[PDB]
Amino acid sequence: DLADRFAELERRYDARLGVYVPATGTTAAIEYRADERFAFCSTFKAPLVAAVLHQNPLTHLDKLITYTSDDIRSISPVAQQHVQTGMTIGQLCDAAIRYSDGTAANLLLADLGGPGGGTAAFTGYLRSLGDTVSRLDAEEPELNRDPPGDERDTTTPHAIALVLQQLVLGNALPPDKRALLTDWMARNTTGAKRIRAGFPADWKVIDKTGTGDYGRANDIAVVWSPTGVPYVVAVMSDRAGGGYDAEPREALLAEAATCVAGVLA
Amino acid sequence: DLADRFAELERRYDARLGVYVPATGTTAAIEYRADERFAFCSTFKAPLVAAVLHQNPLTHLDKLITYTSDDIRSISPVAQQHVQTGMTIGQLCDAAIRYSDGTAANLLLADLGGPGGGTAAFTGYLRSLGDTVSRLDAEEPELNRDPPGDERDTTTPHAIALVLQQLVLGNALPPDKRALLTDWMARNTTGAKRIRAGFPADWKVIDKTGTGDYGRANDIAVVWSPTGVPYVVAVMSDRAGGGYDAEPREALLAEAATCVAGVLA
Amino acid sequence: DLADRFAELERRYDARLGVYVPATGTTAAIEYRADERFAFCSTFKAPLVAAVLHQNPLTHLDKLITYTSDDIRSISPVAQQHVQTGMTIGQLCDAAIRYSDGTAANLLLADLGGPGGGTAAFTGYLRSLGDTVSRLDAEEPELNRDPPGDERDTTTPHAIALVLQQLVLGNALPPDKRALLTDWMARNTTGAKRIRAGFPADWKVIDKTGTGDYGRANDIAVVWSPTGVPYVVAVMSDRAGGGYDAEPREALLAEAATCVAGVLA
Amino acid sequence: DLADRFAELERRYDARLGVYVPATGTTAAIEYRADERFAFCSTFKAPLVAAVLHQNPLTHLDKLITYTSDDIRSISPVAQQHVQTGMTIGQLCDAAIRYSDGTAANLLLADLGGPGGGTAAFTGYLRSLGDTVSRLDAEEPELNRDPPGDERDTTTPHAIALVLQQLVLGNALPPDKRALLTDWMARNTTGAKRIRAGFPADWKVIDKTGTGDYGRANDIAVVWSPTGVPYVVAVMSDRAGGGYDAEPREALLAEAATCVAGVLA
Ligand SMILES: CO/N=C(\C(=O)N[C@@H]1C(=O)N2C(C(=O)O)=C(CSc3nc(=O)c(=O)[nH]n3C)CS[C@H]12)c1csc(N)n1
Ligand SMILES: CO/N=C(\C(=O)N[C@@H]1C(=O)N2C(C(=O)O)=C(CSc3nc(=O)c(=O)[nH]n3C)CS[C@H]12)c1csc(N)n1
Ligand SMILES: CO/N=C(\C(=O)N[C@@H]1C(=O)N2C(C(=O)O)=C(CSc3nc(=O)c(=O)[nH]n3C)CS[C@H]12)c1csc(N)n1
Ligand SMILES: CO/N=C(\C(=O)N[C@@H]1C(=O)N2C(C(=O)O)=C(CSc3nc(=O)c(=O)[nH]n3C)CS[C@H]12)c1csc(N)n1
């Protein structure tokens, strides 16, 4: 009867909603269109940062990347402030996660190197995690604009929830780097109205948002109950019936999250 | 399946849990032990203030009540500091609700007058509101200590939820007096870890708690969704099998509330 | 002033105000009528519990005292609830401090034993702390009623501040017992509108209030700066010019504390 | 003696501190570097909203402003989530004040119109209020980065306090519009550790913060005594000797506020 409530939310917001919460020892998985494809949008920036941490000896975080105003593409609140100074890899990681900085993500992808500006290597990083479904094909901002049904730049709530589970709660990264990724998501500034708005204040929430055209609004999160039990929540949505210009509905993700909180409480 | 989650909570906390949320236009009633009896404890102080407001002109709120050190027979955080100054009816209403002041409640009961020091007149007021179930039989502090199974000083989640619905959302009180009751409950200091802890921060919660021996912990609340839609939530619990000294589990009420929030989201 | 502002408070509230803050390494002492005598009222209950703790092994805390309703004099919110059960020394300590229970204080005095119902031995305990000025002569409730100028049941802001400094910050008690006394004062329920109201919330305040006739209102506190630096604050007041029923003005004490906070910041 | 206490705070925090509290009927002005220039940082957003409120009917708040990803050039916690939805003038006012949203302020400056993207018209509004000292020369984020000694984008504690006094306590705005400005500042999310942290909990505080490079940390507030007596408090600081990256010290502002509270108590 959770599917009835999610399909109810879909009706309310004229949206397609994807929800996945991996099973734990105590709780069964929650699955609503969990294996349908949804566009990454900025949610790839969290595993992208893990890709950078994984293949680099950490001192790489201090490597200074310079760029020009021609490189500033999509919402980049931090990169627009540093054309003159450049930004270290660490600052690009910090910016890409906490401010969803689009230029920072492109520079970090470029740092992965290879064809398609780093997107083949980023997909390849996902494969190293066991995710054979997801793919990144374009950079910011084009990766938000693929039409509905196009498999490029998509993940599934199932696939990305499992990816995030390994990155934050599992062993994808050494504890060294794991802590840096976790802290950046914990101090994310873009998620206040999504999964975080749907869980009671005394649950801890770390998350990475994603937003794009066709009313795409995602949030992937790790949440901790007041007793300290972790759950991974992937909530993805789009509103393709409204066309390219369809507006994201953040309240859909908050309400879907509150529904999830009630099953996990 | 909500009932299954409530039974799991009852198991987790060694508690008996009662939940009632009255039906609305869009939502069905939520009922768990909705018609079983649970001890009022201080939850009676919310309708008590309404009873005093109901039978008195607003100007009665300024009447100064004086009392003695002999009247301090229970936890009275506000009245204890005012034996020498006296206290206004308004301040007793404020104290009974916001600080659960025990002496304030006895003075308001006496202000109702009649047999049992006001206890008969308070019950009759509940009866006048359609509450055929509830009964107040003692004053503070005895009304918290009736043994399990004793019908005295008990209500049901169903009955107290319907009482509270009429007081805050219905027309039991004129708008001026209703606004005073709502404001006192809105500024309550005792409910932070109960229904308020289980609802997301962007839901508005006004409540009146109750706590007693036998692990008794209640919380009656009016909550507003972020869209401004009101619901009445009565959550009552005790741990009576664990004896007189059983500790209340506030976290039980917070978790029950999170379960309810997920169904109302 | 500083003395101009305290004397302005005396004008505003038509009161006599005594303030003492012992010198530290960083701050000079604060003194306003610091050596004039003011009535203890319930502030003696904090050193009384220290007297009881010092004289006895912790196991003494479990000793059960029984009493009758004839012993219940003065404001005794806890002892009124336990005539039939009796109370252990520990809960008598708890009640005397956190609820200013007058009956609990008389029983604890009796446990000190000796002439005057324990008041000579309690006085003697203060002398062991270096306080040669203060004296307890009567029990509850008579100790609140001495006329102005009468030296009985009086202390000075100077003497009691240094008494409390030794009990909480010094070594009058072994760390075991020091923690019990400190925890009781930290969880006091009667001081919300006195020294606690005058200090910013991120200053930690532990206190013991005192209230009596002739507008007597005292508060003795240990406060901790946000960086963790402790100060002892004694604020004592009376309004004897207005006679026996002069009302205490709690707001004088909150304001005096705010003045003290401003010099300690 | 207050100036001595401020000079010590300045020593302790390696900071330059400016404090102004306008005179009242009962209290003298408090002045510490009241006429030295400090950078506005985001404290200008409070009179900015006042300017928008003043030269437009209330219904203007419903006007929908759309903007692009290119407009996100500073920390914009609300506006970076509404590139696709737009934001009303009302929502931009809310955001500029409560979240210090940088894009929101730039969009509001554009709504003021005129040369320099609105910076001339906003300064002209300060002139109409009698502020001959303050000037805004740049938009977000440049106005936070001017070097020490540069007069651009600066105000004084004296000037900003007098502006804020007129806006909240005077008659610069009609009461309908005055209440919106007051309410936004009352619900500000950024000031918990500054003037609000330095005042006792029972003082009402509404404020607008500013933070920038060179250790700049400002807070302008209106505070109400427990008696309901209002004061305007401007506290500004920088640590400019420590360079561009010198860290702001919020505790300096809280301690300065505690000093002022002690004088106003
Ligand atoms: C968790 O998100 N909540 C936010 C929010 O968006 N805050 C952001 C966050 O994490 N921020 C940070 C930073 O990155 O450290 C900062 C620092 S921004 C900055 N820091 C520098 O060191 C520097 O050299 N330049 N700049 C520009 C302040 S708030 C913003 C918020 C805004 S108002 C409010 N109550 N919360
Ligand atoms: C004879 O009465 N017995 C009482 C009693 O005084 N009951 C009253 C009642 O219903 N009250 C309420 C309230 O409004 O809930 C309360 C709960 S307020 C509270 N105090 C805390 O210290 C705390 O940590 N959390 N909370 C929530 C105070 S007792 C009074 C009692 C309380 S616990 C226990 N074992 N007995
Ligand atoms: C800091 O003080 N603030 C108070 C306040 O007065 N709280 C008190 C405090 O510490 N209390 C305690 C207790 O003694 O533990 C209790 C428990 S009283 C109690 N416990 C038992 O186990 C029992 O068998 N019987 N009884 C009667 C609850 S509130 C009161 C307060 C009132 S409303 C609110 N939010 N806080
Ligand atoms: C180029 O601009 N540089 C800025 C800047 O954008 N300044 C703005 C300004 O005045 N702002 C304010 C505010 O309203 O006070 C703030 C302070 S609020 C805040 N910051 C935190 O880091 C945090 O954890 N919690 N909270 C509540 C955000 S930056 C913005 C900056 C911020 S810190 C720094 N070193 N530079």
CB pair distance less than 8 Å for D80 and A190: yes
Q: Give the phi and the psi of residue D46 in degrees, each rounded to 5.
A: -70, -55
In contact, A133 and A155? CB cutoff 8 Å: yes
In contact, C166 and C172? CB cutoff 8 Å: yes
Min Cα distance D72 → chain A (Å) is 6
Judging contacts by C-beta atoms under 8 Å, the chain A residues touching residue B262 are 258-263, 265
Question: How does DSSP classify residue C168?
Answer: I
Q: Any chain B CB within 8 A of the CB of C13?
A: no
The resolution, in Å, is 2.2
Give yes or no for residue B77 CB within 6 A of ligand 3: yes
Please report, for residues B39, C182, C258, D85, D264, the alpha-carbon distance to residue C6 in angstroms, rounded to integers and kept in the order given. Answer: 50, 29, 11, 57, 12
Question: Do β-strands C30-32 and C87-88 pair in parallel, antiparallel, or remain unpaired?
Answer: unpaired
Judging contacts by C-beta atoms under 8 Å, the chain D residues touching residue C265 are 5, 9, 198, 255-256, 258-259, 262
**For residue A234, how many C-alpha atoms fall within 13 Å in the half-sphere facing its CB?**
33
The one catalytic residue among B31, B139, B140, B250 = B140
In contact, A1 and A237? CB cutoff 8 Å: no
Ligand with the closest atom to the CA of C94: 3
Residues with CB under 6 A from ligand 1: A 98, 187, 189; D 75, 77, 99-100, 189-190
Of A81, A245, A250, the CB nearest to D81: A250
Q: Give the phi and the psi of residue B210 in degrees, each rounded to 5.
A: -150, 145
A-chain residue closest to D140, CA distance: A81
The alpha carbon of C98 and the centre of ligand 3 are apart by a number of angstroms equal to 9
Q: Which amino acid is it at B251?
A: A
How crowded is residue D224: how many other Cβ atoms within 10 Å of its Cβ? 15
The alpha carbon of B100 and the centre of ligand 3 are apart by a number of angstroms equal to 10
Residue C64, strand partner residues: C88
In contact, C65 and C72? CB cutoff 8 Å: no
CB pair distance less than 8 Å for C77 and B73: yes
Report the distance separating Cα A243 and Cα A148, nearest Å.
9
Report the distance separating Cα B182 and Cα B20, nearest Å.
20
**For residue C113, how many C-alpha atoms fall within 13 Å in the half-sphere facing its CB?**
2
Angle, helix A119-128 to helix A102-112, in steps of 10 degrees: 80
In sequence order, which ranges of chain D are alpha helices (DSSP H)? 2-13, 45-54, 89-98, 102-112, 119-128, 157-168, 175-186, 195-198, 250-264
Question: Do β-strands C230-238 and C217-224 pair in parallel, antiparallel, or remain unpaired?
Answer: antiparallel
CB pair distance less than 8 Å for C200 and D200: yes
Question: How does DSSP classify residue B199?
Answer: S
Tokens standing for D95? 């955001």
In contact, C193 and C248? CB cutoff 8 Å: no
Judging contacts by C-beta atoms under 8 Å, the chain A residues touching residue B254 are 200, 202, 226
The residue among C153, C130, C158, C129 whose CA lies nearest residue C143 is C153
Report the distance separating Cα D62 and Cα D56, nearest Å.
11
In contact, B89 and B104? CB cutoff 8 Å: no
Of C77, C189, C250, the CB nearest to B74: C77
Report the distance separating Cα D224 and Cα B210, nearest Å.
34
Report the distance separating Cα D43 and Cα D45, nearest Å.
5
Angle, helix D119-128 to helix D45-54, in steps of 10 degrees: 80
Of C198, C200, C255, the CB nearest to D197: C200
Of A199, A226, A256, the CB nearest to B200: A199
In contact, A140 and A106? CB cutoff 8 Å: yes
Tally B–C CB contacts below 8 A.
40
Domains for chain D: give ranges and CATH numbers. 1-265 (3.40.710.10)
Min Cα distance D74 → chain C (Å) is 32
How crowded is residue C137: how many other Cβ atoms within 10 Å of its Cβ? 18
Residues with CB under 6 A from ligand 2: B 41-42, 74-75, 100, 102, 141, 144-145, 190, 209-213
How crowded is residue B65: how many other Cβ atoms within 10 Å of its Cβ? 18
The alpha carbon of D146 and the centre of ligand 4 are apart by a number of angstroms equal to 15
The residue among D130, D137, D141, D135 whose CA lies nearest residue D155 is D135
Of B69, B74, B76, the CB nearest to C74: B69
Q: Any chain D CB within 8 A of the CB of C259?
A: yes
Residue D234: exposed, middle, or buried by beta-carbon count in 10 A (0-12, 13-18, 19+)?
Answer: buried
Tokens standing for C183? 């925890």
In contact, D73 and D140? CB cutoff 8 Å: yes
| Ligand 3 atom, smallest distance to C187 CA | 1
Tokens standing for C61? 């805390």
| Ligand 3 atom, smallest distance to B99 CA | 33
Tokens standing for D40? 């506005």
How crowded is residue D6: how many other Cβ atoms within 10 Å of its Cβ? 20
How crowded is residue B140: how many other Cβ atoms within 10 Å of its Cβ? 25
The alpha carbon of A188 and the centre of ligand 4 are apart by a number of angstroms equal to 15
Q: Any chain B CB within 8 A of the CB of A260?
A: yes
In contact, D140 and D118? CB cutoff 8 Å: no
Report the distance separating Cα B207 and Cα B63, nearest Å.
26
Question: How does DSSP classify residue A5?
Answer: H
Q: Any chain B CB within 8 A of the CB of C117?
A: no
Angle, helix C119-128 to helix C45-54, in steps of 10 degrees: 80
CA-angle at C147, arms to C43 and C112, nearest 5°: 40
The residue among A19, A12, A75, A20 whose CA lies nearest residue A239 is A12
Report the distance separating Cα A188 and Cα D84, nearest Å.
20
The one catalytic residue among D42, D74, D134, D237 = D42
Q: Any chain C CB within 8 A of the CB of D245?
A: no
Please report, for residues A153, B105, B142, the alpha-carbon distance to residue B49 in angstroms, rounded to integers and kept in the order given. Answer: 60, 8, 19
Q: Give the phi and the psi of residue A67 in degrees, each rounded to 5.
A: -155, 175
Report the distance separating Cα A217 and Cα A220, nearest Å.
10
In contact, C73 and C106? CB cutoff 8 Å: yes
In contact, C156 and C38? CB cutoff 8 Å: yes
Q: Any chain C CB within 8 A of the CB of D256?
A: yes
Binding-site residue numbers of C for substrate are: 100, 209-211
Judging contacts by C-beta atoms under 8 Å, the chain C residues touching residue B73 are 77, 80-81
Tokens standing for B89? 């009816």
Q: How far from chain centre, in Å, is Cα C16?
A: 17
The one catalytic residue among A10, A31, A42, A74 = A42
Report the distance separating Cα C116 and Cα A84, nearest Å.
83
**Terminal-residue alpha carbon distance, chain A:** 16
Q: Any chain A CB within 8 A of the CB of D76?
A: yes
In contact, C148 and C132? CB cutoff 8 Å: no
Report the distance separating Cα A207 and Cα A193, nearest Å.
11
Min Cα distance C210 → chain B (Å) is 10
Min Cα distance C76 → chain D (Å) is 28
Residues 181-240 of B with CB under 8 A from A: 197-202, 226
> What does A130-158 look like in DSSP terms, one character per residue?
T--S------TTGGG-PPTT--TTEE-HH
CB pair distance less than 8 Å for C77 and B80: yes
In contact, B235 and B194? CB cutoff 8 Å: yes
- Can you give the C-alpha Rg of chain D in angstroms? 17
Mutate to test the pocket of ligand 4, among D144, D206, D219 (most ligand atoms within 8 A of CB): D144
3-state secondary structure of C218: strand
Dihedral angle of Cα D158, D159, D162, D163, to the nearest 10 degrees: -150
Tokens standing for A129? 């995690």
> CA torsion sign, D124 to D130 to D134 to D139?
negative
Q: How far from chain centre, in Å, is Cα D104?
A: 15
Min Cα distance D145 → chain C (Å) is 30
Report the distance separating Cα C134 and Cα D209, nearest Å.
49
Q: Which amino acid is it at D253?
A: L
Q: Give the phi and the psi of residue A237 in degrees, each rounded to 5.
A: -155, 155
Q: Any chain B CB within 8 A of the CB of C100?
A: yes
Question: How does DSSP classify residue D129?
Answer: T
The residue among B151, B124, B157, B119 whose CA lies nearest residue B6 is B157
The residue among B85, B50, B35 whose CA lies nearest residue B222 is B50
Dihedral angle of Cα B187, B191, B194, B195, to the nearest 10 degrees: -30
